[PDB]
Structures are given as C-alpha cells and as structure tokens.
Amino acid sequence: QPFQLPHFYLPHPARLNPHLDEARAHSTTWAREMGMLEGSGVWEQSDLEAHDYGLLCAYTHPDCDGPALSLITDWYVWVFFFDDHFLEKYKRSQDRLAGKAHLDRLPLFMPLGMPEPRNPVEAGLADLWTRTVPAMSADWRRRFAVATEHLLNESMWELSNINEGRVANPVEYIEMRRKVGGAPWSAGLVEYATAEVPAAVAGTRPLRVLMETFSDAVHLRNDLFSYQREVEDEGELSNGVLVLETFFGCTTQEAADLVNDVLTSRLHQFEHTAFTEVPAVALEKGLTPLEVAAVGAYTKGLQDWQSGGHEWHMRSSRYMNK
Ligand SMILES: NCCCC(O)(P(=O)(O)O)P(=O)(O)O
Ligand SMILES: [Mg+2]
Ligand SMILES: [Mg+2]
Ligand SMILES: [Mg+2]
Incomplete structure (x- = not known):
C-alpha cells in the first residue's frame, strides 16, 4: 500500500436503497446476457460480484423503486465495463487507432434505428x-447523449497522454475531468432517479457551479481510492494524487493529503451552492412550487450520490480500502 487514506470530510450520512439484493441479482444476469463475463477477456463473474455495482447504485440512489435501481445499476455495470474493457483492449497495447474506431461506433447506438452490436459495449x-x-424528455435525451460522448472522448485523451508519457498539470487535470469526465453523465441518471432540472435554471451559474463542485469532488475522491491500482498496475496517468505528486515532486502521502484538502474545499462550496445560490436563482426565475421541488429533489440526489459513493469506495474490490 503506497499511502494511508486521509481523514475524509463526511458531513451527511449515506442511505441505502432497500432493493439492493434485487439490483444485484438482475444486473449480474444482465451482464452475462450482454457478454461481459466469461469470454469477454475483461471480467469473470467473480470480478463483477466483488466490484458490487448493485451496492454502488443502492448507496447513490437510495429512494427509487426496484425497477429504477435495476436500470441504473445496469448503466453503471456498463460504464465500468467500458472502462475496464478500454483499458484491457486498447490502453495496455496503446492502440490509439483501434480505440478511436471502437469509440466512433458507439454514437450509432444512441439515436435521438440502430446497427447490430459487435461487442458487449x-x-x-x-x-x-x-x-x-x-421515460425522459427530448431535451434530457440530447444532453445525456452528449454526456455519454464526453466520457468516450475522455478515454481518448487519457490514452494519448499515456502514449506520450505526459502527466497533466493541476489545472489541466481538473479542467479535463470537468469537460469530458463522467459527472454530467452520473447527474444525468440522478435526474432519472429523481427529477429533471427545470430548463429555467438549468443553464444558470448556480447549477453550473453545483456541477463543478460535484464533478471535482467525486473525481478527487476516486483518485484517492484508485491511485494504487492505476499507478502500479494499470499505468493510468489520470489521477489527482499522481498529478500533484509529479507537479511538486512531493511524497505520495503528501499529495494524497493535499488532494483530500482540495476535496473538502469542493464539498464546502457544494453545500453553500446547494443551500444559498441555487434557492436564490429558483426565486429569481420564479419557479413554481412543483419546479422548485424538482430542483430540490435533484440537488438532494447529488448529495446522496456523494455520500453513498464514498461508502461504496470503502467496500468495493476496485479500491485501496484494506
Ligand atoms: N467509468 C467508470 C470510471 C472508473 C474509475 O472511477 P476507476 O478508478 O474505478 O477505475 P476511473 O477510470 O474514471 O478512474
Ligand atoms: Mg478510466
Ligand atoms: Mg478506471
Ligand atoms: Mg479512478
């Protein structure tokens, strides 16, 4: 183990969806149906069960019913399969040209007909x-497809950095995980689980800031938990602890300690944004009682996502949690 986990800022206790065991059983079955287990060259069933994506989604989406949790869990089974698949098939061979082609096919499976699928992804x-x-609006549809594409562009950017040996500097790293990272995608599914954000506030600064703080925080937390795997097994360079470490030339523990202080700070700004700036713009735009409740449902969703996400990271076999 390369460093000890720091003292995390954890203000709000996580809650756990009671349909957890339903989500587990369904998603494991669905994974095999998609060809993600034996024969994938990526996962065996034991891997999928040890990662425990049913537990992830039950922690991060505590209030939705059994069927919603099952669909969300399959989404996360898919997004992690895509991650481990891309690593195993393209990153480890630094196959940038084949990776590009793989990624280029995927928008064909998000029409706003479809071709026949050739791989589990x-x-x-x-x-x-x-x-x-x-189940969602035409507007959520267009945004969600865009968010999913960004995730795809992320893998490309990461591979190119690995292939050229270039670690991003601290501002570059943050801005890249913001622009093409998977936070808007996750927030896309929080809307599915709760409610879509009213368009009257969707593009405003406080909701933008809400997304920035959510994004930074979830990535920095995961960086702390997955540094060991990424650095001494994967050869992944997209990690905040590694980014600070190379920039300052400090010890691994020192970088993890500062990363965590940045994390706590982003969480503070989220709380302030959720409590003050977002309610203010809801008034300024005159949202109806119903519209205000959707906003509150969604921002509450982001809070529960973050608290649940930490509890998951502390348990999943993907991470450095002893
Ligand atoms: N699509 C899921 C993203 C997975 C990661 O969180 P992990 O650390 O678990 O590998 P990332 O590769 O982004 O660091
Ligand atoms: Mg990745
Ligand atoms: Mg990864
Ligand atoms: Mg990671």
Whole structure:
C-alpha cells in the first residue's frame, strides 16, 4: 500500500436503497446476457460480484423503486465495463487507432434505428438506451447523449497522454475531468432517479457551479481510492494524487493529503451552492412550487450520490480500502 487514506470530510450520512439484493441479482444476469463475463477477456463473474455495482447504485440512489435501481445499476455495470474493457483492449497495447474506431461506433447506438452490436459495449449501450430514453424528455435525451460522448472522448485523451508519457498539470487535470469526465453523465441518471432540472435554471451559474463542485469532488475522491491500482498496475496517468505528486515532486502521502484538502474545499462550496445560490436563482426565475421541488429533489440526489459513493469506495474490490 503506497499511502494511508486521509481523514475524509463526511458531513451527511449515506442511505441505502432497500432493493439492493434485487439490483444485484438482475444486473449480474444482465451482464452475462450482454457478454461481459466469461469470454469477454475483461471480467469473470467473480470480478463483477466483488466490484458490487448493485451496492454502488443502492448507496447513490437510495429512494427509487426496484425497477429504477435495476436500470441504473445496469448503466453503471456498463460504464465500468467500458472502462475496464478500454483499458484491457486498447490502453495496455496503446492502440490509439483501434480505440478511436471502437469509440466512433458507439454514437450509432444512441439515436435521438440502430446497427447490430459487435461487442458487449455496443450490446449494453443499445439495450440501456432503448430502455431509458422513453421515460425522459427530448431535451434530457440530447444532453445525456452528449454526456455519454464526453466520457468516450475522455478515454481518448487519457490514452494519448499515456502514449506520450505526459502527466497533466493541476489545472489541466481538473479542467479535463470537468469537460469530458463522467459527472454530467452520473447527474444525468440522478435526474432519472429523481427529477429533471427545470430548463429555467438549468443553464444558470448556480447549477453550473453545483456541477463543478460535484464533478471535482467525486473525481478527487476516486483518485484517492484508485491511485494504487492505476499507478502500479494499470499505468493510468489520470489521477489527482499522481498529478500533484509529479507537479511538486512531493511524497505520495503528501499529495494524497493535499488532494483530500482540495476535496473538502469542493464539498464546502457544494453545500453553500446547494443551500444559498441555487434557492436564490429558483426565486429569481420564479419557479413554481412543483419546479422548485424538482430542483430540490435533484440537488438532494447529488448529495446522496456523494455520500453513498464514498461508502461504496470503502467496500468495493476496485479500491485501496484494506
Ligand atoms: N467509468 C467508470 C470510471 C472508473 C474509475 O472511477 P476507476 O478508478 O474505478 O477505475 P476511473 O477510470 O474514471 O478512474
Ligand atoms: Mg478510466
Ligand atoms: Mg478506471
Ligand atoms: Mg479512478
């Protein structure tokens, strides 16, 4: 173990969806149906169960019913399969050209007909997209497809950095995980689980800031938990602890300690944003009682996502949690 986990700022206790065991059973079955287990070259069933994405989603989406949790869990099974698949098939061989082609096919499985799927990533996305889109607005649809594409562009950017040996500097790292990282995608599914953000406030600064603080915080937390795997097994350079470490030339523990202080700070700004800036713009735009409740449902969702996410990271076999 390369460093000891720091003292985390954890103000709000996590809650756990009672449909957890339902989500587990369904998603493991769905994974095999998509071809993500034996024969994938990526996961065996034992891997998927040890990662425990049912537990992740039950922690991060505590209030939705059994069917919603099952769909969300499949989404996360898919997003992590895509991550480990891309690593195993393209990153470890630094196959930038084949990676590009792989990624270029995936938008064909998010129509705003579809081709036949040739791999589990394509198969999973096709399935999820058809199951999810009918329940949401046409506007959520366009935003969610964009968010999913950003995730895809992220893998490319990361691979190119690995291939050229270039670690991003601290501002570059943050801005890149903001622009193409998976926080808007996660927040996209929080809306599915809670309510879509009223368009009257969706593009305003306080909701933008709310997303910035949410994004920074979730990535920095994961960086702390996955540094060991990423640095001494994967060769992944997209990690905040590694970014500070190379920039300052400090010890691993020193960088993790500062990363965590940055994390606590982002969490502070989230709380302030959620409590003050967002309610203010809700008044300024004259949202109805119903619209205000949707906003509150969503921001509350982000809070529970973060608290649950930490409890998951402390348990999943993906991470440095002893
Ligand atoms: N799509 C899921 C993202 C997975 C990660 O969180 P992990 O540390 O678990 O590998 P990332 O690769 O972004 O660091
Ligand atoms: Mg990744
Ligand atoms: Mg990863
Ligand atoms: Mg990580």
